[model samples]
Target: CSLDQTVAPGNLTLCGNATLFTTFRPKARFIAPEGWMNAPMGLYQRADGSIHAGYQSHPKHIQWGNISQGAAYSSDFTSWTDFNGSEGYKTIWPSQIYDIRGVFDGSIIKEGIDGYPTILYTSTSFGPLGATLNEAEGTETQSLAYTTDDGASWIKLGYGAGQNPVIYEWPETNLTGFRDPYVFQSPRLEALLANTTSITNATGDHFATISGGVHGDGARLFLYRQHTTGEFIKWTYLGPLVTTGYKESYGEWSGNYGINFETAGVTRLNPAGAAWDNGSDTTAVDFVTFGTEQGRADHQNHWPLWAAVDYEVRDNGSIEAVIAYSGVQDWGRSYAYASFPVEGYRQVSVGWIYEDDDNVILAKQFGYQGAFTLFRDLFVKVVENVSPSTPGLFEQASWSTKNSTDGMSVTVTTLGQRVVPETLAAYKGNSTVSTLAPVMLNESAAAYTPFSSQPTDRFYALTGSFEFGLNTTAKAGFRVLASEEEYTDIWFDPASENLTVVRTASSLIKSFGNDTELAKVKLYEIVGAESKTLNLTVFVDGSVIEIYANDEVALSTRAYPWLANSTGAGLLADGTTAGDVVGVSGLELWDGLVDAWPARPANTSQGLVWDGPTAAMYGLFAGY
Candidate 1:
């Protein structure tokens, strides 16, 4: 956003696409200037030992302008030096000589003993002389700019392509879209380093990626390793870091984006006139694993979309991914998902709830405990890993029961923990009663005690009496509440003497389309022998909820569970008295059976800290 003025609000709308809920906006964690921000070119470390970040900015109020990049420097990695143009800052701008038209997404590279910093970005036009050997066809091309004296001043080095664009779009590859010239270097190429002046006239050791492509089926991450030989300004295009969604290729899909499918799409491009609506003409096939640099992909191949990636090698020869434009899950959805909940290719083109710590800036200054902790918690619970279970399909777990009336204890463990129910007995309570020690689950994850039966890629159950308490019924069942005002209720109805679930228990997000119902009621026979009995089993892969009831019908619904602390679960009893009754007998449970990420112990933290002479970073999740 180059040519305009702006305003940065505390709350920003990151678009309408939601995987489970309206994911966090940039401001939620990382703070951008109090103006507008576009493509984040990430950070560059200065020679003296500080980092600088440059991003695309123009105006404010959800608007875009000249689309040029802006710079900001940081010492502590938490607090930054705002570069709102103070003398040398002007040097970062495009000169009338070339690249004066417009600039877009790009990355900065620091090299040698000086750790000399340079900015490479996409421009709409190649200024002055009009060009280079590879001119981006007069469209979106990469331009170069670097800083001397630790970034106070810069030298606008024109565009890439012929002058070492670092990297450019590989004809039939990913993105085929706009631009992002994300550049980086690996230790494997360290020995090939050079302290040269010009980009093309001097290269070697540094690697880069010209982010997207135009494959027939969709997009993939295109990687290019720089040449190791002397004054090399070129890179070796490594096709793609991974494969793209194949055209008409069908296979079993077992990822976050789809249910356990026998065969389906890996990328959801071109859903036009097909089974689901992308809310557009086409839901383009794009992106791969981005690092905590923006997108966060767990252990396996995740649906990172178009998030950027920064690689880090471990002492034990392991790799970690820090993806930007990300969150805990990769399953995104539009209202379209509501219509076709079971489809394999839903919300394929939806955007991720990019995390930044914008909210962090408001509360504190340059601290990462909050941001790093949240990031670690998210990946630990979601990242998948295989667990060794019993030899067969049946994985047994123990459920320890705690009934206000009567109960015992037992524990069985494997992929996770489980509790089993022993028996059910009659219990009584006075008016206004609720459980004193309700089955409280405050841990990061939870499991049921009674898997007398397990929930599967498919699940179901039946019962004679699913009674709440003795005779009174104001409301009784389970409630998932993060706060008093923001909680959802699963109600047991006595008047209709049936079962009902209320989802709109929050004032936070209410797309609340009157046409869109978030609540449901399922009535079972309630007279005499059937009295107090209700049958139900629920299946929600992510934030949204899906139900399979009475072994008869299937229902799909969405719910927005927000806030790191807001995510919670427990067996709640609607109260008449403080002694609301609950028991483990006859109640059953099972999980991790479908649309699943195999269970494994959550590591919680890797204890990573970024601080060095030429590099510094805050917030940790594992990978640098």
Candidate 2:
């Protein structure tokens, strides 16, 4: 194909009058088969134990046009099945008002008391400029629907009166609010009161958590309980668990499409206090934080969405974790729908890359939901503060490999030299670094994860050493944070003896790792000798990634994740003809650690960093 923009189409119908793209369409990441998808919600677990998610989809992966409720499932972390018109399950058509304009983010309440499943979604004439929530008839509203045979046929569950909305926005305001309903069986008053001791108090077999972005408030979380009064089992709306910091109208940033739009920079209710030591800035208080303040201990995910349970936050947090984790990465890439029970909570750390606007629309629609799989690795553990827990969903806790073909031996150590406990003496008290045991990966693709619910402000520290004998034919390094089709490769290019990194997958979400365009790669030359061992360190603080190597070199760039739920790390080897030697040993990784650069652009007012390339990087420190 020409990979040209003219050949591409636009979603002008849904987005109203807009920019026509000759740009590319989405194909790889979790982008819709139709090209684009939005607000991944409704994480439901089937009776036989499967996974399902609801998302707002668009044709050509263009703007959110001709919206629809797209459903899909995965049997493996790498595979999926989405529903379309051919299957008779087209966009959950506008049967109700709450979600008339189109069916958006939703939640599936597994099998009810009877043997079927229920879907709660955001309905409206919404999706105007930049996919903002418009009128719910009167404002952005919500509706309910269900299906039997595991997502085949469907039915509306709305009533004329009371629970018709299933659950509406904080009705007090005149704003068209309330959308993205995520329902599940939550712990009752028993576990609700458990608070921190969630392990013991965490009960509830029925509950729902929704994302509510109001007029003035950034974003709010509402909790609802399934109460039985008389014959009806209605949902009672409880106030927000934590007052979110979603200043929808707060700051203004250039939208993904080059348009200026308001952003949701949600902070925490209790707040993370001090400015944050690590890459974290936004607060995520209440949970168990170390040092009490000063650093990112309190700051959590800055702009993540999809779903949050007490879920898991970045930095000091985990899945079943009591304390929460925090993070952010947005715009089109692959918006993730995550939940504790999401075929194992499809999971993010917010690493972004940019590529040409090359988008694609796949038309593979099926009848019922398909099977899926959830892959977890040591990377998640290091970032989420879950050194204690492994993937309960999979048999393997960590991913490793050591190629010993001799002609080309390779050792993958994305984690580190060894896996260290979060409780280790070094990490026990105010830590400078949180290290994971040595992880190994053979010649393979990138092993990744997502930011799940929303983006976080967490920072990570990664350090490793590598050595290979004879003629080094290909490149060897870490493929940090990636999706099925896109990744940010930080490796050593033997050709130019340059340490290179590239975030050129434009289709994923435009990023800044490179100064140019499309697979745009910038390199830093290694010093000393070409045959000497190379030591490299990378600091991932929020949207920026900084790499330092033995050549006394440094390369820094900002990035945005395309697949919000599939950002991860792994080993990388590119050999022109098979037997290309790619080996890396003595690898180590640290989670939620302080800034490795130490002298980053000091207090840039908005915390946004840009254009600090190699050589000049150090000198540019806090200045330009």
Candidate 3:
């Protein structure tokens, strides 16, 4: 069956003619087993077909109860099989001596002096337990871990500071705040690079030096050289990676509650100073926000979002560095929500914008309303600036014509019936209609053209104005030998404007002597042509017609429409004269209205509007 025929029965539709395969969303939801909620994170597909996802999830609720160790893992991208499931221990908020506030920012790299996969993360023990009860105060400590297996497990390699408690609390300068570890192995420097916000700055330089701090206030990025011993040596602060102006207007807001927005992820996708404000020097803070970078929530409707990245190896020997993220919004939750009722595809990443957050909440709320949202399967194809290719091109046939012959008339007592020579005996109650052995034909020969040599072929003549119903109508056309060799080229006479066809063959056979000798013939019009010759080579088994010439210069297009209109073999020649040698070969018909063909372009962006499920599947079971 054609794609349209198969998909027409369901809510699915064709996106294009391109050979697009489908993938279902994974069944697993949320990262941890239970009691934890997983939000958007950095997702990358590794070379081994596994997915490395780095996200922060707390064992206990951070706002409600307590905070614990943030974890990372590698999965098959479809199912969960933890790598370090047995080794990691969970800890809670600061008691300082034995506890840590919570590890927030984390990322991974495969290259370090240790020659193993390394994980860089922030460790804080500054916050006092139950201090103020709302906010945890702990100094941000940078730490590193490594594993030989591809994220299956890890070993805590020690801290990024040359010694434990690397910088300590630099009290003189309020530059004490430090957390959110964004690390990457830089090939340019042949070392590991880490960036964090500065809490205090003793030096009034607008650009807070990134390396000078042991553990103080002011945002800075520390450059560390991995030694042969597998230890990261804190070399120098690279100055403010992203500092505000000298007036402290820029850096201070990043620390303030109302405006201070910490950088989420270090995206190599857009340039450094592309979407957000990143100061170049003391004179100017480079901030340029383009419309394309506008948040998804700004759109009226929520759109389906997808993300992908190209894996690359840096010169520094870091393997598979990927920058994956999401795309523009489509439909709003009030409009539509993403559902994973079916299994195969993944929607793991989304922007941390306000509107996106709201939609997320709405999607969760609608869980009580419906078990699953209907997903429209889209069959896509790519046609290069040509006409859309017909779906189920070889499955069925269709033809449209009006009868204009005045003296003779055509009436389709049956419109669409499936007729096969093999099923003829069963359709006719006692072999009566089957014994008549009727022939299928075009309207012209059935009505106007004389058929002396072959009376059976001319039984049905092409007539005018035989309305079947609504958008569907039929007329007589050239007849065929049996249910097996059904004639389908039935077309409207261009001059007469009435459906017709001519048969020049002699001794037409009606019923197959045996099942082995039954021949199947299909007929239908080839859209883009005028007149064409069909060359037929007849054997005892079957007959074949190859079109000779036409405007498109194509082969003989098989006619299958007659079979689409066949049923019991009464050969309903309802409008013809009595005693007319209208050798009834096969007859098929249906009631109700024929639907209008789809009008939208195959690649149209317009989506399906809900007209109720019944209306959607109308075309699918039309002839059933």
Best candidate, lDDT-wise?
2
Per-residue accuracy of model 2 over 1-624 as CA lDDT, tens digit each: 222222322322232211212112211123233334445555555676555555554443333344676666543322345554454335475656555556656666666535567776666553331113343333445666767667654677655676556555453352324555555443222232334323222234455554444444433454555554121236655444334333321111111111111111111111112111122322222121000001111111122221112433322111222213222122122223233343222221111122222221211111001111111111121111112112121111121223445423222211111111221222223233434444333344233322212112224445666554335556667666555655577767655455656666512433222332111111211223334355666645444454655422334444444344334565665552334444455555554443211222222111112323641443311211
TM-score between model 1 and native? 0.41
Q: How many backbone collisions does model 1 have? A: 57
| Top candidate when judged by TM-score against the true structure | 2
Compose the digit string of candidate 3's lDDT tens values, residues 1-624: 132321212212222212111111101111332122222222334446555554444332211112333234333222233334553323212233312545434344445337665555455553432111222233555555555665555556443345433323332233323443444322222212212112111111111111111121222222222322234433223333332211121111011111111222322111111121132222211111001111122332112221222233233322232212222111112111111111232212222111112222222111111111111211111111111122222221111122225422221110111111111222122111212223433342233332222212211211112112111223333333333333323332222222222222211222211111111121222333222122221101012111111111111111111222211111223233332222222222111111111221222111112224653254211110
Q: Please write out the lDDT profile of model 1 over residues 366-411, one tens digit for every residue.
A: 1111111001000001111111221111122110111222222212
Candidates sorted on TM-score, descending? 2, 1, 3
Q: Give candidate 1 misplaced runs (Cα > 4 Å).
A: 1-28, 45-51, 75-77, 86-102, 112-115, 126-138, 159-175, 187-203, 228-232, 236-238, 246-288, 291-387, 390-624
RMSD of each: 19.5, 18.6, 25.8
lDDT (CA) for every model shown? 0.32, 0.37, 0.25
lDDT winner, 2 or 3:
2
Q: How does candidate 1 score on lDDT?
A: 0.32
Ranked candidates, highest lDDT first: 2, 1, 3
Question: In model 2, where do residues sit more than 4 Å from their true spots?
Answer: 1-31, 81-91, 125-138, 169-176, 193-205, 229-233, 246-302, 305-325, 328-336, 340-583, 586-624
Alpha carbon lDDT at 387, candidate 2 = 20
